[PDB]
Structure 1
Amino acid sequence: MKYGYFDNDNREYVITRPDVPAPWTNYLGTEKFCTVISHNAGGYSFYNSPEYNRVTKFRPNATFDRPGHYVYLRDDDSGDYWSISWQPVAKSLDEAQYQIRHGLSYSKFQCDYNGIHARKTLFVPKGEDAEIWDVVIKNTSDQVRTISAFSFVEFSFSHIQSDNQNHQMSLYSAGTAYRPGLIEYDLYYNTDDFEGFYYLASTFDPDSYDGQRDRFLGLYRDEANPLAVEQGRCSNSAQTCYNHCGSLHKQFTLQPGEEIRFAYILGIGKGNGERLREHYQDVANIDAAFAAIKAHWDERCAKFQVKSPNQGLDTMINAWTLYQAETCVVWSRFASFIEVGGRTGLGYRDTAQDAISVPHANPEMTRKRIVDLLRGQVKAGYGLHLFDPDWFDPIHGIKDTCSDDHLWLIPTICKYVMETGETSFFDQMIPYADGGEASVYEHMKAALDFSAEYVGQTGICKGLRADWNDCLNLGGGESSMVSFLHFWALQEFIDLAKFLGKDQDVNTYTEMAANVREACETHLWDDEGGWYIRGLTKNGDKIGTAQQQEGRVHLESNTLAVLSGLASQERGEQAMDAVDEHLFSPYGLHLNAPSFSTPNDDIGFVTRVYQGVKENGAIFSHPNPWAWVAETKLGRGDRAMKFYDALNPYNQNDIIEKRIAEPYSYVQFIMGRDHQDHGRANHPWLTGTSGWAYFAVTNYILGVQSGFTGLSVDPCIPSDWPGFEVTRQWRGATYHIQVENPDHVSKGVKSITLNGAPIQGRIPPQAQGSDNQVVVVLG
C-alpha cells in the first residue's frame, strides 16, 4: 500500500491521499527560522533555539498533530467549510481530493472540493525570519461563489516548558494587538523588539480577526470546528493574557473560473509584519522568493549528481538524502515531531559525524559546525556530550563523558579541508570550552591522546559513560567500537601530518595506531564464531562471543573493524559474512543478535531494553551505512548494494502499511525481528543515518573522494552494472566522471584519463571554473 510517489522532475514527493498512518513531515527554512510541517499542515515553527524560541505551539504524541498552520475556506452561501490541508476539518475523502507536494524547503497543499480549487504553499524565504503562506483560490464551478478564508496558528509562549507547564506564569506572559492586516503577538517578558514579538499578517485587508484562541475556536470546540469559521466571521479579539492565535479573515466573491491570490505571513520581530504584508501584495515578490528557494537547492544538488542502473539510489542521492543530511547539519537533531523539548543545541558525536557528509554542497555551514564542536571540546580532549553552540559563540566532568564523541571530529575535519582546500584552517586558534585555546591541529591531537590514555590493561578503549551505543555503558569496561574508531581517526590524522610534513607526529601516531591494531587483533577476534566481539565488561568478560546465548554478533564492532581499515581482508570478510548471515533482514541490518533478555549492568542498559527495539536487537539505521563502506573496502559491491537496497526508504514506497514512516527519509530505527511490529520505521529526518548513507554511497560505492592533493575515483559497484556517471563539483571546478565496467568486475581501476590524457592515481585539482572529463575503466 502506498500514499504517494516520487516526482523526480520537480524534486518533490507527491502525497495523493492524506490519510497516511502517520504524519509525513518536511522542513521549511535554511537560515534561522524553521518549520516542521506535516502533510496535514500540523506542526510548528521556531527561531534558532527550538527550546527557547518556539513560535507556534505543538501538542505532541497525540492521535492528531495539532495545532498547525491552517487555512480554512468557507462557502458563505451554504456555510460549508473545509481546510486546504485535509486535517483539521477532515472533509470526506469521497468528497474532497487532496494532494501534498513536499519539496526541498517548501510544501504545497492542494484541495479540490465542490467547485473550489485551492492551493497553499508554505515556505520560509531566505533573508527573512518568517513563513509565507502563498494561497490561491479558484472558482472551478459554473456559478458565482462567495468564499471566505481564515488563517490560524496558536502562538507559543516561546519556551517549550512554558507551553507544556507552569501556566500559572505563562498564561499572563503575553498579549495580542491588532493593526490593519496584522496580529501582533507580544511576549511581554521578553524586552527584545525582535525576538520578543511574533506576528501573523495578511496581504489582504481583513474583514475580521481574532487574537484570542478561545474566541476563534470557541467553547468546547477545537481546530476541527472553529466557532469563527462555522459562523463565518471572527470576533475581533485582542487582549493581554490567556492563549493567543493569529487569525485573519477575508471574504471573496469569485466569478466562474476566476482565481485570486494572497498571502499570510507568520514571523518574528516588530516592524517586519507591516513591511512584509506590503511587500508580498505584489505577488511577483512571492514568486521571486520561491525562486530563490529553488535556486538554493538547485545549486547544492548540481554539485553531485549520479546516473546509474539503480533508480532508487539515483533518486535519493540526487536530492532526498542530500536534503536530509544537510537538514541535520543546519538544524541539528532536536526539532521534529519526536524531539519536542528538553534536549537542545548540538549533540557532539551527532554533529561531528553529520558534518562529514555535505562539505561539497554547504562548506560554510560545515565549517561553522566544526568550529562549534571545537569550541565545545575541553582541554582534556573530550567533547561536551550535549551543548548549545551559542554558549561559546564570540562543562561536565569525566563521569558524563562519552568515549567516542571527540574521535568522530577527526575524520570530519580532515574531510572538510580536503574538500575546500582551506589548509590554513589547521592553524586557526580556537578556545577550549573550559578555558584556554589551541590551534585546530592541537585540538585534534588532544582528542587522539585522550583515547590513547583512556584504555584498559589490554589496550582497548574504555567505554566510559557510553560509546557510540548510548545504551552500552561499560565505564571501566572496554569498547571494540571506540578502539576501531580511534584507529580510523589515527589513520586520518597520519595522512594529514604526512601531508603537512609533521614528521614527528607521523611517527608518534603511526606508533600509536600500531599498538591499537595489535591490541584489537589480539583480544577482540572470536575465532570460534569468526567475528569481532563488542567489547569487555569491567570485570574482563568478553561481550559478543560464539558461546554466549544473547548478543553474540554485533554490527558496530564488525563494520567498524573494516571501515577503520584495522582488520585484515580475511577477518574482514568473515566478520561481515557473520553480519550478513545473522543480522540481515529485508528491512536492513539488525544491530545485534540474538537480542538481550537478561538484565546485566556489566554490559549495559541495552540488557534492559525490549527485544527488537532501539539498541537491543532492532534495525538501528545509523550503523547500516558503515556496513556498506566495509563491503566496498572488501571489494564486494553486490553485497554492499544488497544492504543499500534493503534500507533505502525509496524501495518501501508501497509497503507503508508495514513501514509507516516517510518513504523519502531515513529513520533512527526499524523494529527488529524480535518485535511484533517488525518493519515499522521510527523517527525520520534527524538521524545521522542520512549523512552517513550519503557519505557511504558517494565516497565508497560510487567511490568519489576529495583528497588533500587530488580527487580519487575508485568505485565498488554490483558486478552487473555496465557503468555509471557522476557530475562532481570540487574546489570550484567540475569533474564529469564516466565509469565503464566492460569486464563486469566490482572494484579495481584499470585506467583513468583526464581530459583525454591517461593519468596515474589522484586527479590534481584543476583551475577554477574548469570542466573536466574523467573516464574511469574498471578491470
Structure 2
Amino acid sequence: MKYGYFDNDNREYVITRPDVPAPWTNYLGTEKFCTVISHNAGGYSFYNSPEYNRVTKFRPNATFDRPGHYVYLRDDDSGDYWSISWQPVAKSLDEAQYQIRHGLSYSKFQCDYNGIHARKTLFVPKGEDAEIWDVVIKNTSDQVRTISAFSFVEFSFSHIQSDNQNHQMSLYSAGTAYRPGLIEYDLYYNTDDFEGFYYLASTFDPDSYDGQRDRFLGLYRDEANPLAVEQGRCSNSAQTCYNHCGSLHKQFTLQPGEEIRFAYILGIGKGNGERLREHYQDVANIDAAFAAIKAHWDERCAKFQVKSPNQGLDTMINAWTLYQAETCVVWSRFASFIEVGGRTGLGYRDTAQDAISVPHANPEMTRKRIVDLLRGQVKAGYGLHLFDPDWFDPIHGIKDTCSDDHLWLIPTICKYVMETGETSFFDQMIPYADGGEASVYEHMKAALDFSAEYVGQTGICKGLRADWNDCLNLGGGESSMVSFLHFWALQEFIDLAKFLGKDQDVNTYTEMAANVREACETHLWDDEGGWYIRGLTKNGDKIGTAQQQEGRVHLESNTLAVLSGLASQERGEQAMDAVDEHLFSPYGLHLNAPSFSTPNDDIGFVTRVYQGVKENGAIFSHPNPWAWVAETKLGRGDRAMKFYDALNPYNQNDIIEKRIAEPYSYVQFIMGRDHQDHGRANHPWLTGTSGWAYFAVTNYILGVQSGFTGLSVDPCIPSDWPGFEVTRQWRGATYHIQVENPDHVSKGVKSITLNGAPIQGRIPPQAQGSDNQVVVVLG
C-alpha cells in the first residue's frame, strides 16, 4: 500500500490520500523560526529554542496531531464547512479530494470539494521570523459561490512545560489584543518586545476575529467543529488570561471560475505583523519570498548531483537525504513529533557526527556547529553530553561522561577544513566549557589524549556512562566501539599532523594508534565465531562471543573495526560476513543478535529493553551506513548496495502498511525480527542516520572525497554498474566526474584524466569558477 509518490521534477513528495497511518511531517524554516508540520497541517512552530520559545501549541502522542495551522472554508449559502488540510474537519474522502506536496522548506496543501478548489502553501521566508500561509480559493462550479475563510492557531505560553503543566501560573501569563488584520499575542512576563510577542495577521481586512480559544472553538467542541466556523462568524474576542488563538475571518463572493489569493502570517515580534500583512498584500512579494526558498535549496542541491543506475539512490542523494541531513545540522535533534519537550540544545555526539555530512552545501552552519561543540568541550578533553550552545556563545562530571562523544569531532573538523580549505581554523582560540582556552588543534589533541588515558589494563577504551549505544553502560568495563572510533580519529589526526608538518605529533599519535591496533587485534577478536566482540564488562567477561546465548554478534564493533581502518582485510571480511549472515533483514541490519533477555547491569540497560526494540535487537538505522562504508573499504560494492537498498525509505514507498513512517525520511529504528511489529519504522527526520547515509554514499560508494591537497575519486559500486556521473562543487570550482566501468569490477581505478590529461592521485584544487572534466576508468 502507498499514500503518495516522489515527484523528481519538482523535488516534492506528493501525498495523494491524507488518511496515512501516521503524521508525515516536513520542516519549514532555515534560520531561527521553525515549523514542524504534518500532511494534516498538525504541528507547531518555535523560535530558536523549542523548549523556551514555542510559538503555537502541540498535544503530542495522540490519535490526532493537534492543534495545527488550519484554514477552514465555509459555504455561507449552505453552512457547510471543511478545512484545506483534510483534518481537522475530515470531510469524507468520497466527497473531497486532498493532495499534499511536501517540498524543501515548504508544504503545499490542496483540497477540491463540491465546486471549490483551495490551495494553501505554508513556508517560512528567509529574512523573517514568521510563517506565510499563501491561500488561493477558486470557484470551479457553474454558479456564484460565497465562501468564508477562517484561520486558527493556538498560541503557546512559550515554555513547553507551561503548556503541559503549571497552568495555575501560565493561564494568567498572556493576553490578546486586536488591530486591523492583526491579533497580537502578549507573553506578559516576557519584557522583550521581540521574543515576548507573537501574532497572526491577514493580508485582507477581516470581517471578524477571535483571540480567545474558548470562544472560537466553543464549549464541548474542538478543532474538528469550531463554533465560529459553524455559525459563520467569530465573536471578536480579545482579552488577558486563559487560552489564546489567532483566528481571522473574511467572506468572499466568487463568480464562476473566479479565484482570489490572500495570506495569513504567523510570526514573532512587535511591529512585524503590521509590516508583513501590508508587504504581502502585493502577492508578488509572496512569490519572491517563495522563489528565495527554492533558490536556497537549488544552490545546495547543485553542489553534489549524481546520475546512476539506481533511481532510489539518485532521488534521495540529490534531494531528500541532503535535506534531512542539513535539517539535523541546522535544527538539531529536539524538535519533532517525537521530541516534544525536556531535552533541548545540542547532543554532543549527534551534532559532531551530523556536521561531517554537508560542509560542501552549508559550510557556514557546519563551522558554527563545530565551534559550538568545541566550546562545549572541557579541558579534560571530553564533551558535555547535552548542552545549550547559547550558554557558551560569547558542566557535568566524569560520571555523566559518555566515552565516544568527543572523538567524533576529530574526523568532522578535519573534513570541514578539507572541504573549505580554511586551514587557519586550526589556530583559532576557543574557550573550554570549564574555563581556559586552547587552539582548535589543541582541543582535538585533548580529545585524543582523553581516550588514551581512560583505558583498561589491556589497552581498550573504558565505556564510562555509555558509548555510542546509550544502553551499553560499562563504566570501568571496556568498549570495542570506542577503541575503534579512537583509531579512526587517530588516523584522521595523523594525516592532519603530516599535512601541517607537525612531526612530533605525527610520531606521538602514530605510536598511540599502533598501540590501539595491537590491543584490539589481540583482545577483541573471537576466532570461534569469526567477528569482533562488543566489549568487556568491568569484571573482564567478554560481551559478544560465539559461546554466549544472548547478544553474540554486534553491528557497532564489527562495522567500525573496518570503517576505522583498524581491522585487516581478512578479519574485516569475515566480521562483516557475520553481520550479513546474522544481522541482515529485508528492512536493514539489526544492531545485535540474538536479542538480550536476561537483565545484566554489567552490560547495561540494553539487557532490560524489549527484544527487537530500540537498542536491543532492533534495526537501529544510524550504524547501517557504517556497514556500507565498511563494505566499500573491503571492496565489496554489491554487498554495500544490498544494505543500502534494504534501508532506503524510497524503496518502501509501497509497503506503508508495514513501515508506517515517511518513505522519504530515515528513522531512528525499525522493529526487529523479535517483535511482532517487525518492519515498522519509528522516529523520522531527526536521526543521525541521514547525515551518515549521505556521507557514506557520496564519499564511499560514489567515492568522492575532498582532501587537504586534492579531490579523490575512488568508488566502490555494484559490479554490474556500467558507470555513473557526479557533479561536484569544491572550493569554488566545479568537477564534472564521469566514472566508467567497462570491465565490470567493483572497486579499483585504472586511470583518471583531468581536462583530457592523465593524472596520478588526487585532483589538485582548480581555479575559482573553473569547470573541470574528470574521467575515471575503473579496472
TM-score, normalised via structure 1 length: 1.00
Distance 1:69 1:393 in 2: 33
Distance 1:93 1:700 in 2: 46
- What is the CA distance between 1:454 and its match in structure 2? 0.2
- What is the CA distance between 1:394 and its match in structure 2? 0.8
- What is the CA distance between 1:43 and its match in structure 2? 0.0
- What is the CA distance between 1:362 and its match in structure 2? 0.1
Distance 1:621 1:455 in 2: 28
Distance 2:686 2:662 in 1: 12
- What is the CA distance between 1:594 and its match in structure 2? 0.2
Partner of 1:208: 208
- What is the CA distance between 1:34 and its match in structure 2? 0.1
Distance 1:288 1:419 in 2: 32
- What is the CA distance between 1:403 and its match in structure 2? 0.3
Distance 1:181 1:464 in 2: 57
- What is the CA distance between 1:453 and its match in structure 2? 0.1
- What is the CA distance between 1:639 and its match in structure 2? 0.1
Distance 2:201 2:95 in 1: 31
Deviations 1:68-125, CA, capped at 9 Å, x for gaps: 0000000000000000000000000000000000000000000000000000000000
- Superposition pairs for residues 416-565 of structure 1, below 5 Å? 416-565=416-565
Distance 1:478 1:32 in 2: 41
- What is the CA distance between 1:54 and its match in structure 2? 0.1
- What is the CA distance between 1:364 and its match in structure 2? 0.1
- What is the CA distance between 1:532 and its match in structure 2? 0.1
- What is the CA distance between 1:378 and its match in structure 2? 0.2
Distance 1:764 1:674 in 2: 51
Partner of 1:199: 199
- What is the CA distance between 1:57 and its match in structure 2? 0.0
- What is the CA distance between 1:651 and its match in structure 2? 0.0
Partner of 1:265: 265
Distance 1:150 1:157 in 2: 22
- What is the CA distance between 1:579 and its match in structure 2? 0.1
SS of the equivalent of 1:374 reads: helix
- What is the CA distance between 1:202 and its match in structure 2? 0.1
Distance 1:141 1:645 in 2: 46
- What is the CA distance between 1:281 and its match in structure 2? 0.0
Distance 2:219 2:272 in 1: 33
Distance 2:63 2:96 in 1: 22
Deviations 1:698-749, CA, capped at 9 Å, x for gaps: 0000000000000000000000000000000000000000000000000000
- What is the CA distance between 1:605 and its match in structure 2? 0.3
Distance 1:546 1:634 in 2: 23
Moved beyond 2 Å, runs of 4+: none
Deviations 1:506-530, CA, capped at 9 Å, x for gaps: 0000000000000000000000000
- What is the CA distance between 1:46 and its match in structure 2? 0.1
Deviations 1:635-673, CA, capped at 9 Å, x for gaps: 000000000000000000000000000000000000000
Distance 1:368 1:764 in 2: 27
Distance 1:142 1:79 in 2: 19
Unmatched segments (≥5 aa) in structure 2: none
- What is the CA distance between 1:240 and its match in structure 2? 0.1
Distance 2:84 2:761 in 1: 56
Distance 2:329 2:462 in 1: 28
Aligned-pair RMSD on alpha carbons? Answer: 0.1
SS of the equivalent of 2:250 reads: strand
- What is the CA distance between 1:589 and its match in structure 2? 0.1
SS of the equivalent of 2:233 reads: coil
Distance 2:576 2:728 in 1: 30
Distance 1:583 1:401 in 2: 30
SS of the equivalent of 1:399 reads: helix
- What is the CA distance between 1:457 and its match in structure 2? 0.3
Distance 2:391 2:134 in 1: 37
Deviations 1:411-452, CA, capped at 9 Å, x for gaps: 000000000000000000000000000000000000000000
Partner of 1:283: 283
- What is the CA distance between 1:455 and its match in structure 2? 0.3
Deviations 1:523-577, CA, capped at 9 Å, x for gaps: 0000000000000000000000000000000000000000000000000000000
SS of the equivalent of 1:511 reads: helix
Partner of 2:700: 700
Distance 2:394 2:259 in 1: 51
Distance 1:290 1:538 in 2: 57
TM-score, normalised via structure 2 length: 1.00
Partner of 2:178: 178
Deviations 1:262-298, CA, capped at 9 Å, x for gaps: 0000000000000000000000000000000000000
- What is the CA distance between 1:580 and its match in structure 2? 0.1
SS of the equivalent of 1:267 reads: strand
Partner of 2:106: 106
Distance 1:658 1:398 in 2: 42
Distance 1:291 1:603 in 2: 53
- What is the CA distance between 1:162 and its match in structure 2? 0.1
Distance 2:707 2:363 in 1: 15
SS of the equivalent of 2:443 reads: helix
Deviations 1:384-416, CA, capped at 9 Å, x for gaps: 000000000010000000000000000000000
Deviations 1:333-352, CA, capped at 9 Å, x for gaps: 00000000000000000000
- What is the CA distance between 1:45 and its match in structure 2? 0.1
Distance 2:435 2:196 in 1: 32
- What is the CA distance between 1:201 and its match in structure 2? 0.0
Distance 1:511 1:387 in 2: 34
Distance 1:126 1:390 in 2: 22
- What is the CA distance between 1:496 and its match in structure 2? 0.1
Distance 1:350 1:254 in 2: 52
- Superposition pairs for residues 751-770 of structure 1, below 5 Å? 751-770=751-770
Distance 2:642 2:431 in 1: 45
Distance 1:603 1:396 in 2: 23
Distance 1:459 1:604 in 2: 21
Distance 1:462 1:582 in 2: 27
Deviations 1:126-156, CA, capped at 9 Å, x for gaps: 0000000000000000000000000000000
Distance 2:57 2:557 in 1: 42
- What is the CA distance between 1:226 and its match in structure 2? 0.1
- What is the CA distance between 1:602 and its match in structure 2? 0.3
Partner of 2:140: 140
Distance 1:213 1:766 in 2: 60
Distance 1:443 1:95 in 2: 63
- What is the CA distance between 1:312 and its match in structure 2? 0.1
Distance 1:50 1:761 in 2: 47
- What is the CA distance between 1:774 and its match in structure 2? 0.1
Partner of 1:308: 308
Distance 2:142 2:9 in 1: 33
- What is the CA distance between 1:690 and its match in structure 2? 0.1
Deviations 1:454-478, CA, capped at 9 Å, x for gaps: 0000100000000000000000000
Deviations 1:662-696, CA, capped at 9 Å, x for gaps: 00000000000000000000000000000000000
Distance 2:155 2:458 in 1: 57
SS of the equivalent of 1:407 reads: helix
| Residues matched between the structures, number | 779
Distance 1:571 1:468 in 2: 23
- What is the CA distance between 1:252 and its match in structure 2? 0.1
Distance 1:535 1:405 in 2: 17
Deviations 1:217-245, CA, capped at 9 Å, x for gaps: 00000000000000000000000000000
Unmatched segments (≥5 aa) in structure 1: none
Partner of 2:649: 649
- What is the CA distance between 1:60 and its match in structure 2? 0.1
Partner of 1:190: 190
Distance 2:93 2:78 in 1: 20
SS of the equivalent of 2:398 reads: coil
Partner of 2:40: 40
Distance 2:42 2:568 in 1: 51
